[PDB]
Symmetry: C2
Subunit: 155 residues, 2 copies
């Protein structure tokens, strides 16, 4: 069903897995390509690790209200494709994802996920009685997988 | 880790399990839409999670349901005045919830408290293909949960 982009990675309070599988139909359609126009669905599985308790997250919890963008670059190429992910549910639960088309065809790509904190959408209790001790990250978190091979559908 | 006071009993509505609590007003960063700590009577919280029926939408039982739009309507019983207060999603030491600092504008006594829970709309997508998708669908009109004759008795803190 699901194919890893690479090994799972910890970054700050986040645990970030990247997977891909067949392109999907989404309701509403969102920002990404239609199923027939796409090569795959790409998905960032983002959850809190143990350090997330500093912001009030339980370990393993989905972290919502993030802003996630993927950068897809053919190795040796002068151009990078930028793809906004949206939050969504599949049968396997919440994630950030998008239908994606590899613009340079089958080959070796570098894949980066850029993960921005919630900002003014999501609040934090900061008082001592009920509050958390941590604060959201200010610089976007970057997870990168080198030498991902896109070899067409595996489904 | 801190004292929480009940608004009635936990209620199920659609795929949601909804409980209300309140406690001392809090400091929020950023401040959001609601009253400041020193201007409010309490912090009011809606704890919204998926029940067993939430699996139809791909939610795990008990998990927080994000991207909802939650508003509270607070009406003193016998009064025509209805206060409306938007809740925002946020984390406290006990985890995610929707909440706001609120003021009971008509003083001590009986209030009807309604939580109006709008579905995410264009903010949250659903896979709907057969292979990876879900067969449940979000609600067009808000889910409403109400506790009648909640008693505001003043701060214990
Ligand atoms: Cu998806
Ligand atoms: Cu709160």
């Amino acid at each position: 069903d699901e194919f890893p982009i690479g090994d799972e990675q910890d970054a700050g309070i986040l645990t970030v897995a990247g997977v891909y599988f067949q392109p999907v139909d989404m309701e509403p359609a969102g920002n990404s390509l239609s199923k027939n126009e796409a090569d795959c669905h790409m998905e960032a599985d983002i959850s809190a690790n143990e350090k997330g308790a500093t912001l009030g997250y339980g370990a393993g919890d989905f972290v919502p209200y993030l802003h996630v963008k993927a950068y897809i670059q053919k190795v040796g190429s002068s151009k990078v494709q930028e793809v906004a992910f949206m939050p969504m549910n599949a049968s396997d639960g919440p994630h950030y994802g998008a239908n994606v088309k590899f613009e340079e065809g089958l080959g070796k790509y570098n894949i980066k996920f850029e993960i921005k904190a919630p900002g003014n959408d999501y609040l934090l209790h900061v008082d001592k009685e009920t509050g958390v001790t941590g604060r959201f990250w200010t610089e976007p978190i970057v997870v990168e997988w080198k030498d991902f091979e896109w070899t067409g559908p595996q489904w």
